[model samples]
Target: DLGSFKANFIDSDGNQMTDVVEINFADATEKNISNLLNTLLGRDREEFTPYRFRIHIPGKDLIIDQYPNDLLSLLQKHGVTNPFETTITLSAEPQAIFKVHAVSRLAHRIPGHGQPILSCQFSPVSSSRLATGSGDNTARIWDTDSGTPKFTLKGHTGWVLGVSWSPDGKYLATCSMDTTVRVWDPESGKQVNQEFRGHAKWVLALAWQPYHLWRDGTARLASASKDCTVRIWLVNTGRTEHVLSGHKGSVSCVKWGGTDLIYTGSHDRSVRVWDAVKGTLVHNFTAHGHWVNHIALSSDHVLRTAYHDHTKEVPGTEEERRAKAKERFEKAAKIKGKVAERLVSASDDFTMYLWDPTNNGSKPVARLLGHQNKVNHVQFSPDGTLIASAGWDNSTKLWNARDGKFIKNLRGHVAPVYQCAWSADSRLVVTGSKDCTLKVWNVRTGKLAMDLPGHEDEVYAVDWAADGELVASGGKDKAVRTWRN
Candidate 1:
């Protein structure tokens, strides 16, 4: 008899089973503990889905998921207190298991853009379609399946800064340095309405009103600009709906959240949240020491892929579509009966901040400090459980999205990493860097899985499609390349 301890078994929701179990460390293996838990629940011997157990030290959330030896010894080795009175909280996660193979070979090299491509994003509906913004003052649509250019949307007079596809996959919005935003029909490759004109300077970024929030057939559009104002537009009428005027410096990134909130990050070292319907400023987060480079939301994944969950079956009517989209959002954002959408902001201060401005006041959830230099791009995994950030420090770091805790550093590039995207399964991450290479890294192992070297110049933008079929990347070489496993 090694030892015995008294502890309560707790479920994921903090429902404690009052039956105190005497745990003998000599016989307390994972299987034995699982059987004990099942006995406590009064379940007989049956085919049961296994549960992954974690020990949570109450006050200090330091968690230990790996219990190689006995549970008591494992906790003591990790500097945890004596397990005699601790509550063992077990999370029974019945998750869908999927795999995304690391992209090995370059599938297609389509040279269409005459200038350096600035941004590239896969369509939410399918990976067969891709949209790219370039320095040639135009945004183009590509049939990724055929490896051919579909349409060259020519309207902006200056360099195209950003490109975004509508959640319904009905329209693509392009913003440019010419201070005008245009919406185009993907099927017809024609402008849907007159150019949306209002910004005083070069437009920087664009965000569409989430599909679930679409009132009519069209979703509201918001474009951030160098003039320090964000203009919301009516897509169907090409009219300026309302102006979100607050940022003291150039607005860099904007994301329309699922909670009917719009978030903007600025070079003025601040992030502001606005009420989407009334266009009123809700809260201001002024904690970053330097320019805020980029911002990504935890709910961005569901909002971007609205109603298009790998099933690829969209509802027939708008009501049904809205209901489906809302359900998906609720499934992802609801925790403990509250819909708390969180966000992360990257900055030139060499740090990142995780925020829950919806529930918590103006304070940030955690200040992430690891990058040696300014952080360039930050994004949440499709599952919203992990956050990956690339920066001028020449290293890409992975962090815990829930608490902004550093997990691992992915160091391979000799130069700075420009951008990175997560696969649909959230297992793999692909990043493009100034080192003129695109590398796919395994998130679990924290090691490079694929070293893609073909681009003649710096790789600027990269995206792994939501369907997990392919990866698209563009850079200074003027070639938009697609990769597959």
Candidate 2:
């Protein structure tokens, strides 16, 4: 047994505590020290609140967040420690993830879309609404409160390929094969008519500007078309702002990240980053083996639902709401000592690349490969800690979002896993596949939580509402279905 050591603890603010704890270094660990500090801090109080804190050794440059071994043994093992009166930084964990009960049972199923529905996305702000794109050349908005369909967005003449909701839940940006990028004011219960069209050919993908960046009006939109160009549509004018023309082939996917960057992946096997404000090309990513189709960021959660929370709290004014959104964005984007953004792009080459655009030049942080078939969709969890890849290989693979390390294979679907969505708590993932099924998989256990069987044909899209109220899924069956706990 090792002798006892006197260690003084310092708070995150550098205010060191006066009473040094005398504990045996052989038994001192995250668990024992946690209780020690709890008793020390709560000495005068009757009701004690046990806190989980991290220990950062400033002298040894070590962090004992979860020590598997004792302090003395671990300290002596590394080139990183000493038995002196070490000043250890003690910090309580901030931002605990709120729990969400997994959704079960198909609560509502409505047949409204004349053709097969292609994409599904719940509103970022609440569980009140869902937006779906269909082959019927229209997008439909659904009420999650009731099973009723609210509005049929009838403007686009071609197949609605995708539907994007504004982070604030004020507008719906729908792209169509008829070469139109239409923004529907579902809240347009107020507007008579509006239009946005610029693409010369069928448009495939679109993204809205982040809410934190919405300094004025309803925010700008970015659309990538088969014409190999990405266009910015200004909301106020209901027209084009800037045409980002650089790609030699079809611009397959585009993402407007929280950072001042707009990313576009093209059929030329290239990904390009543009300055969203200046409309100038900032940099280009490495050439992939094939076409890049989808891109997602770790900050997609905060950027998608700005000024919004599940607590159902509301700001008094629009300016106040915007202020809250701006401040929240900074906290999530602050990573690794700087404000950084992490990216993952899915490609037809059966590979995905993780990128750090702000910190790393043209190069990706890590290359992810495993799928036997094409990786169709890739997304980061809301907390930005894990990543899930929905692939055509009949499996969805999980990975360490921070390091791009493969974790587990979520296997069940006999056919290709076309699209997937992570629950708000990041504890579960819901996937839709060509096997005509939707499966909710547990993130920690990496096992099938529930097998939902309803669709008669291939399942196309799936979405878990941020409010943890429902999951709306649609597919080739030409029907919209919602699941609830």
Candidate 3:
């Protein structure tokens, strides 16, 4: 007789065997177990042994390799029932796995104004803050984190058409249909000085000079008006610094680039470039068949330089690195002073134009044509590689900034696409529509990431934060809405 022992096993699916089997020395080492398995289980095999196996007693930690050898009394002690004839078998099925995808979702909406919203923008320094203009003759500031109004700027006699922040984030500039522009302190919600008064008609757009220029101790602002003139204003004094007049119709949009140049778009179907200091027209572009609706310039430090190898290399010493970097900076500064920068313009002619304003040619670098209706807005990506244009055709189109080659059309808005902005990484785009919805799209995947609906009426303005973490929109709903990742 042999002593009885318990055997435990694990299945392929990792399930532990709860049923225990008793091992006996009835057939000695039981070398014929493989034959018994093949004959009983009907499984064909060359051998009866497992790849590996272990045996142990039921109650202790010690594992035994050889079958227990003992007299019949030991087997009888445990009341073992036909231990030699007992057999156990176990099996398991394969397991499966699954993956999930995530997309953007709505965060919240901000409501306060009494009239339709005309424009909305995030602060250049702290994107969590926002500024909005409305048809109710008021401008509002909001804290995006809480989706609540921080200040209600009330002073404009007519509908506020646009709102922009100074590059330094110290002041807010607003244009109105009442033929005036106002600068205000965002902290106190009061006018910085007397209102800027020069334009003969409604002021359509406003832009601030880059921060570095303000460091020279003077703040400069530009305004385009329906009077067909672009006025350069001395912000501190509320005085007109220079008057640039060349366009044949109302000036609809204006932009002041970091290079000390101003670009203006007009109803005359032309885009004009002007010297900010001299207040003289430097060049004019005439190609659009209809009114020029909007114009945009590349972001700060976007211009290329000739000292590629110098700045790209790792200098051997700290002194050498500083000197090399300084040289590259000087070169870039010189280029900014003399080089004609690049810009893009959208028009009611259902086309867009890419221009190298510094180039001598009277013609544009490229003519982009794809829209079925009037193009209302065009903007260059912060990285200066992609262009986004929105149109009355109810779609937004993407293009290669360099060659103006058509990339693809973002079609989802049921009504006209009014405005668009690019993310900091240039991998996403946000668009506003007359359909009263804002949609965010993934550039690489060409898929709609979020469909944000909150405004009760048409959305007129929309902006994405410089950091790509926040988005703001204003519309006919008379409110500003902030969305987050």
After TM-score superposition, what is the CA distance of residue 60 in candidate 3 from its true location, in Å?
Answer: 75
lDDT string, candidate 1, 58-84, tens digits: 547676655466676666766667566
Clashing residue pairs for model 3: 340-358
Query: What RMSD does each model have against the real structure?
Result: 3.8, 5.3, 22.4
Q: Please state the error at residue 383 of candidate 2 in Å.
A: 1.4
Candidate 2 lDDT, 221-249, residue by residue in tens: 89999999999877878767788988999
Total backbone collisions, model 2? 1
Candidate 2 stretches with Cα past 4 Å from truth are 1-95, 188-192, 216-218
Error of 2 at 120 (Å): 1.1
Candidate 3 residue spans exceeding 4 A from truth: 1-103, 300-340
State every prediction's TM-score relative to the real structure: 0.88, 0.84, 0.71
Question: Considering every candidate listed, which one attains the maximal lDDT?
Answer: 1
